[PDB]
Amino acid sequence: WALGLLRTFDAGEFAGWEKVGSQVYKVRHVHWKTWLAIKCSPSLHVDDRERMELLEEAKKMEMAKFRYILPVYGICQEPVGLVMEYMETGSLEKLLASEPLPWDLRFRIVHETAVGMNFLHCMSPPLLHLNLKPANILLDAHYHVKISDFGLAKCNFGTIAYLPPERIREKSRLFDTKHDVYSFAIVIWGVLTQKKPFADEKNILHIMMKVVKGHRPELPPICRPRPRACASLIGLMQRCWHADPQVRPTFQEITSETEDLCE
């Protein structure tokens, strides 16, 4: 059902190719008189593993069409690329590095992210994102969230930070919803601090092992402008990164809590 509504694009349809990635381009679609985004494959050869995986990525984005999930329009062949809605503000990662953000916006970003993740986990069967980090949380012109980057999702280096400890303890464990919950904990931490996690520490491997034994990013202090809400968010964050997956809350329980923070 997913591959049906998608379109094949041709590069002549696009103009004004302008790098936004980190490769991703903002392109004008001339006939539609609107801008779109296209994520082009890095590889030198137009490989058949990729062309099917980019389709998978697109197909999974269409299955989770929702307010807080990036819309997807289809595929380009001429350059192999995934075609999708353009988000004017860009990534959360970029926003956290740009300037201090008002607290009420921080709580809204967190909530909206939680709402979208809840939507994925409520599908039948659940859809695990497995790559939730600020670089894949996109923000529209009005700073509303749309989750993106479904390359690793399953219907069954920055990344070590977002990796759950059970994924380091066990070779080849079954992916579950509790993976996404841990990663979300590390997303909250970044929103609280506006820092990248472990950006100080040099021995990546040493930190890995410490994490297996319950070590996490340093807790931020309670902020002056919204100390009640901030304390509540820090507390939620901590339950979300618990070492035991089964103790971590569900996104159903999380969204209930983050909604109260937005008042």
Ligand X SMILES: Nc1ncnc2c1ncn2[C@@H]1O[C@H](COP(=O)(O)OP(=O)(O)OP(=O)(O)O)[C@@H](O)[C@H]1O
In the complex, which residues of this chain contact Mg ion (CB under 5 A)?
Answer: 135-136, 149
The Cα diameter of the chain in Å comes to: 56
Cα of first residue to Cα of last residue in the chain, in angstroms, is 40
The one of Mg ion, ligand X, Cl ion, none whose footprint includes residue 148, by CB under 5 to 8 A per kind, is: ligand X
Closest distance of CB 102 from ligand X, Å: 22
Supply the minimum distance, in Å, between the C-beta of residue 149 and Mg ion. Answer: 4
Q: At its nearest, how many Å lie between Mg ion and the CB of residue 150?
A: 10
DSSP for residue 88:
T
Amino acid code (one letter) for 188: I
Which among 44-52, 116-124, 143-151, 160-168 is the span making contact with ligand X, rule CB under 6 A?
143-151
The CA distance from 145 to 153, in Å, is: 19
Is residue 113 within 8 Å of residue 95, measured between CB atoms?
Answer: no
Among 5, 8, 16, 22, binds ligand X (CB under 6 A): 22
Q: Which stretch binds ligand X (CB under 6 A): 112-120, 134-142, 188-196, 251-259?
A: 134-142
Q: Which CB, 39 or 106, lies closer to Mg ion? A: 39
- Residue 138 lies near ligand X (rule: CB under 6 A): yes
Residues 6+ apart with CB under 8 A from 172: none
Q: CB 92 → Cl ion: shortest distance, Å? A: 22
Position 159 contacts ligand X (CB under 6 A): no
Q: How far apart are CA 115 and CA 225, in angstroms?
A: 25
Which window, 20-28, 59-67, 102-110, 113-121, contacts ligand X (CB under 6 A)?
20-28
Q: Is 90 in the site for ligand X (CB under 6 A)?
A: yes
Q: Find which of Mg ion, Cl ion, ligand X, none residue 39 binds, CB within 5 to 8 Å per kind.
A: ligand X
Q: Are 165 and 243 in contact (CB under 8 A)?
A: yes
CA 126 to each of CA 5, 132, 200, 236, 242: distance values in angstroms, whole numbers, following the listed order: 22, 15, 36, 23, 22
Tell whether residue 80 is a contact of ligand X (CB under 6 A).
Answer: no
- Tell me the one-letter amino acid at 24: V
52 by DSSP, 3-state: which?
A: helix
- Nearest-approach distance from CB 31 to ligand X, in angstroms: 19
Backbone discontinuities in the chain, residue before each (C to N > 2.5 A):
22, 156
Q: Is 21 in the site for ligand X (CB under 6 A)?
A: yes
The answer to whether 93 and 133 are in contact (CB under 8 A) is: yes
- Specify the residue, 95 or 233, whose C-beta has the smaller distance to ligand X: 95
Residue with smaller CB distance to ligand X, 186 or 233: 186
66: part of which helix (H) or strand (E)?
Answer: none
- What are the residues binding ligand X (CB under 6 A)? 20-22, 24, 37, 39, 70, 84-87, 90-91, 94, 135-136, 138, 148-149, 151
